[PDB]
Design a protein around this ligand. Structure first.
Ligand code: 861
Ligand code: CA
Length: 191
């Protein structure tokens, strides 16, 4: 057996790779990152709890067919996922430096939204068009009205929105199913 199959999971997306046992894992890591639209260095890949280095081969690490590699977002400082009393979760990926978003203000953001299996359902960046809304105004889903509060301009926050703070039992747009948890990455551009 000259080749093996490896699964990379980021906790949402699961992608399989067929690779020669003597090929550096760089190729797999770069192929995985390419798909998620990121640079290989923005991610950490773990095998058996140990970070993979790009020059290492499957043979080097004694990997077997159908072994699993976990992909985590590089977050140097270390992050904290916050869970509020409503059940909303959020994590500041980058802290802003600018003014703070407060309820009642009109704010402008870029965003991407995904389902929990990793499927992208929308992004403002796809239309190169920042999105403005009145924070706390009931014109966006509740998880946004809560979750964007306290962001500072320049900040990137990742919201994990349970369905009662999203589209509930009815879903949305022929794409978001009933009872969907939603993941958004939101960048605050202006307040
Ligand atoms: C269909 O039901 C509703 C629709 C709206 C319209 C605004 C929808 O947009 C959003 O709230 C979120 C957050 C802010 C940016 C846009 N998103 S969004 O999820 O990406 C909208 C979307 C795009 C593509 C397919 C399905 C859904 C508001 C709602 O709440 C006031 C709704 O009730 C839960
Ligand atoms: Ca706009």
């Amino acid at each position: 057996e000259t080749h093996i199959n490896l699964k990379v999971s980021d906790g949402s997306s699961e992608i399989f790779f067929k690779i020669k046992k003597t090929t550096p894992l760089r190729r797999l890591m770069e192929a995985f990152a390419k798909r998620q639209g990121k640079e290989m260095d923005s991610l950490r890949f773990l095998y058996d709890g140990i970070r993979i280095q790009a020059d290492q081969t499957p043979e080097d690490l004694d990997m077997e067919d159908n072994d699993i590699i976990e992909a985590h977002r590089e977050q140097i400082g270390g992050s904290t996922v916050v869970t509020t009393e409503s059940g909303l979760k959020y994590e500041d990926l980058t802290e802003g430096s600018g003014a703070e978003a407060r309820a009642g203000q009109t704010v402008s953001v870029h965003y991407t939204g995904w389902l929990t299996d990793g499927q992208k359902f929308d992004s403002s960046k796809d239309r190169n068009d920042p999105f403005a809304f009145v924070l706390g105004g009931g014109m966006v889903i509740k998880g946004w009205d809560e979750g964007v509060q306290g962001m500072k301009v320049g900040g990137v926050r990742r919201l994990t929105i349970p369905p009662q703070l999203g589209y509930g039992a009815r879903g949305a747009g022929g794409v978001i199913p009933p009872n969907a948890t939603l993941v958004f990455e939101v960048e605050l551009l202006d307040v």
